[PDB]
């Protein structure tokens, strides 16, 4: 009973880009995805996105979450909305029309837009907003009942109408049946040759139908990004929105102007975020965490009490009270247990570090399992790749792998094992063993007399 | 003759925190510590801090620098001040009352507050300030002599009094004897059931005693932090204060909005601080230093001419013209001499690097002494930990430790020694020696024909 | 036919510096260099810079691009300009006078200044600007023809003249012959004992010569840096100028307030610059590049499609679709081909990595050539320095150098070679070979029973 049409065919010429406008990112995700999530979060079931030539990247990114309709020619917004008729023309209920270049639109406003429309039994409802400098925008003229009288564009406005501060956002809610009926009645008798969607509204008005106006108190949210300066203004607007939310929810953010937290991040209370931190994707941070300065964390889970210092973390999990960094990298599939230590200049990839394990410096752990409380010395490497395949390394619990050791996978090191520093280990090592593979020392005294 | 009562029992509910409000940090230290230092710096000898249930962390952090008095119930500010009677009731002289959630309060203003109070022989003095939007604050009504007539709260203020821009800061100076006398005379005949400290002032007034008003020209400094948004505003205020001080003192700060220098840092002239740098604790930086972008330095000494590039430095000392980084870590007890080089991906901990020593890449030096002009090759490690104890490594002067060498401590390498690349060294090496511990090379030509 | 005199002898006492004022940097280069480039970019052929005692650093930095004249005493701006008479007194054409402490001056404004001067056949032209708060600056009084009547300093101005918003910038264009003629006629009959350059203008006026006024619409550009707070304001002004330019030219800048791009950097469209990035010197970045957060890039070339993540890059070249970082360092002379990978904690110096080569972690490559598609294992080192000289390493194509290998230069590894992990390689290795230099493994089962 609720549908949505997202306009994504814009060339965005001022972007000076080879990519479609709505694919440029804010807070780590394309603008069209922000709109999609606000639309879906508002209660819309079916979504159609209008695309242009060479829109594989748009369809590729949005995937199955949207239907698609192709606009071969740019003949205006009314024309673009009509291309969705294949999917929606015979549907009943509410349909909202939004542009994919308005990434700050909130689901709250779309919800209320739809509720206002439905509770009024309107044929169409305009999302409006009040701005300080209205120059250039279509002005809402209200009738005596508070409903829409007309949208006066500035090019055809008397001096009185020009003083109106309430403007059209270009976001509308329609009776779906009416919308597609009136779309066939729009003409392009103008200098651009285009079919303009607001014309539908005048058509409903000249038919005695109800056209409502709903005004949002947040004019920032209807921002339309047309160039990369505006793109950066959208980032700053989203930054302030999100950071204010987290601070009032119990997260300390030392410098919110320099801290970048995407919209799908959840952060528990009493957590401290230091300056420059960048947290994006679907990330969950527990209570009492410290994320240290200039870290980057994407699509990860960080449990309570953990400390991440100037590190890079992607698609990883970090258990309770675990310490990572400074200058460490957790790559996809890194899984650290509780009370683990991953020190400076350590890289972890597709590896499971059990509780209490310590990898304190200058090591690489890949395709590997490190048992509880095991110590991995400085300079040690899981040698996992042979130029053809990747092979697994297993280290048991309470073991001590010395410094500058190479574990040549596939290989298994038992529990309570000591591997001497400097050893290249090719053979499995049983529990409670000493393993050594290095030359003994020759000292040539006075060789340099 | 001068005492202070610091109110620290606030729950700070809007903080959404499990910790006491005054323990949250600005510029690297709890707000209550900022207040303590301003109080002590103003000439106050004895300090009492009022605490609540479970205040071990407050007492633990402030230690012996303060006495403590327990407030079992939250019955208002007058009640909280009274809990200090155990320590102060029979004392003579001036007593100032400040809240632990006002971290920007300066010692200069507290000094002048006390001097104004004493030079007037007042029984009490109110710190006031002038604000643009006075809504909500108690208004200072002055009498014909310029002294205090009454503090009108907004809830009980006529339309005239509401236009007053001068407000009460809630910071007072008292004759100590009078204060504790009048505290027993305060009632809680109000809707909150609380004993309010400003009531003491009206009591002195109705007794013919002198009540002065001292106005600070800096209304920022009386800021009371009640949530984490305000906490971030306090950080930005302290940032601007400190950075302006250093720039006018001869320090170049490339981007002061992104540079974080705590209040106990001293920086010599002609030093350059690059963007993102974070410097905290008791740190001393000499003249002609460059601190490069996104470094973190805490509780350290950096001598003249040194260069620190994107590195992490804690509890360390760096001698003149020494170069550190990019991406190096100096851990507690790292001591670098003059003209030393510590290169990328090097970690130094509890180690003494004498003048001219070079550790240029991918090395770990712990619990060790490196002599003058000695070169430590890439990938080399002091193997200091055996899973039970830590052991020391000594390297002499003018020595050359090759790449990927493991020094298995305890071990001593003499002067003018060469250790061949790839050696695990277990035995002491005398002066002017060659030491080698590695396999010779086998070449299997056409093995991969 | 066009000359320039740059005043660089200022002590800049408020700088609290041991260095000359105009040598302090904005956007990675001394203020006097910014002025020089604007001057040269305006069509000026001959440049004279006026210097003081101990100006070796000024001459050293600006080199042969400028002539030099020495000002022994600070007797005013007219005196300073006169010291250029040795080089210019007998020249014909236009001469502009600018200060070396005005780093935001644009070549566009200097061009138009010169064109206005020449097209008017003026004897002198004043660069003016309109400011909101004119207090303190000399005011332009225009005559009935629009030409200059007089510059009224505030100390000698009637209440009317004080309301003028148009002020003198202190930047002038002169008929070169007139300028040096009138310089001998300036007196120092004032409280400072100084010869003031604007006096030349009154001399031309009292002779019936034409004195024009050209007003720039950008009052920011005439900013004179007198202390380090103002120095930081110049950095922010240049930051906003440059970042706006790149955004409107098709570069996405995620946080332009925290992104620092020098004026000699060129960046191709569809490139993304993440927060904290610092790019300086003569750097060329191609299209479709990602520069990741908190990177530093100086004097380098980055080709299309490359990705640089939190890394330090100096005097290096990076080929198309090559990936660098996080936490890597490219040092002078690093040359990476196309589709190369340089992973975390890798250092490259004076080394050529051919197309497809991979150095993925914890390695050092110096003075070396790495052939196409060759894989350098983790922990591997080109051992290039012997404490006396540096020696070269050659690795062929399609080779596999195992982990923790030391290549002791000079040494040559052939094509399709495998070097076993843990090997110290001292001898050349022919094509299609296996090379190994490590101890075999001893396993002492139950040694730790
Ligand atoms: C910075 C950090 O990360 S610190 C954390 C990392 N910690 C480490 O790397 C510690 C590593 N320590 C070592 O490698 C030490 O040299 C140790 C533990 C092997 C010393 O062994 P110790 O027991 O002290 O000495 P010892 O010489 O008796 O060695 C024990 C056995 O190994 C044998 N052995 C010693 N060296 C060798 C060798 N090169 N080849 C073969 N066997 C050897 C001894 O002969 C003895 O065997 P046996 O009892 O059958 O005769
Ligand atoms: C990237 C950076 O950090 S660069 C800075 C680090 N620099 C280094 O690591 C440089 C290290 N260099 C090396 O290890 C070299 O291989 C060197 C210095 C040992 C070369 O030694 P050279 O003198 O050139 O050669 P040579 O083979 O003659 O070695 C000298 C002695 O060592 C002996 N020797 C050589 N290899 C071995 C070995 N594996 N085991 C035992 N003895 C050996 C030789 O037999 C000779 O002894 P002798 O005179 O009694 O016969
Ligand atoms: C994390 C990363 O960066 S992963 C990417 C890096 N990858 C690597 O480092 C992989 C390195 N792999 C290795 O070093 C392995 O141990 C390999 C490739 C040498 C294994 O060799 P394999 O062919 O599997 O085994 P094998 O034991 O048969 O060795 C082949 C030959 O070397 C010989 N050999 C093995 N070890 C030694 C040794 N220590 N000394 C001398 N010769 C040796 C064997 O005797 C055999 O020779 P032969 O045919 O004449 O008898």
Numbering used by the authors:
A (entry chain A), B (entry chain A), C (entry chain A): 2 to 450
From the primary publication:
One example is the bifunctional enzyme N‐acetylglucosamine 1‐phosphate uridyltransferase (GlmU) which completes one of the early cytoplasmic steps in the pathway, converting α‐D‐glucosamine 1‐phosphate (GlcN 1‐P) to uridine diphosphate‐N‐acetylglucosamine (UDP‐GlcNAc). This occurs in a two‐step process, with the acetyltransferase activity of GlmU first catalyzing the reaction of acetyl coenzyme A (AcCoA) and GlcN 1‐P to form CoA and N‐acetylglucosamine 1‐phosphate (GlcNAc 1‐P). Subsequently, the uridyltransferase activity of GlmU catalyzes the Mg2+‐dependent reaction of UTP with GlcNAc 1‐P to form UDP‐GlcNAc and pyrophosphate. We identified that Staphylococcus aureus GlmU (SaGlmU), which was previously targeted for inhibitor development, possesses a dual‐cysteine variation (C379/C404) within the acetyltransferase active site.
The overall fold was highly conserved in both structures, with an all‐atom RMSD of 0.76 Å. Both structures were obtained under reducing conditions in the presence of 0.5 mM DTT. Finally, the interface between the AcCoA and GlcN 1‐P sites of SaGlmU, where C379 and C404 are located, was compared to the corresponding region of SpGlmU. For the cocrystal structure of SaGlmU complexed with AcCoA and citrate, which was crystallized in the presence of DTT, this region closely resembled that of SpGlmU complexed with AcCoA. Position 379 differs between the two isozymes, with the additional thiol sidechain of C379 (SaGlmU) oriented away from the acetyl group. However, this does not introduce any notable structural differences compared to SpGlmU, with the sidechains of key catalytic residues E348 and H362 occupying the same positions in both enzymes (Sulzenbacher et al., 2001). C404 (SaGlmU) and S404 (SpGlmU) adopt the same orientation, both within hydrogen bonding distance to the thioester carbonyl of AcCoA, which is further stabilized by an additional hydrogen bond with the backbone amide of C379 (SaGlmU) or A379 (SpGlmU). Therefore, C404 is likely to share a similar role to S404 in the acetyltransferase reaction, which was proposed to facilitate recognition of AcCoA and/or stabilization of the resulting tetrahedral reaction intermediate (Sulzenbacher et al., 2001). Therefore, we propose that the acetyltransferase activity of SaGlmU is repressed under non‐reducing conditions due to disulfide formation between C379 and C404, which simultaneously clashes with AcCoA and prevents C404 from hydrogen bonding to the thioester carbonyl of AcCoA and the subsequent tetrahedral reaction intermediate.
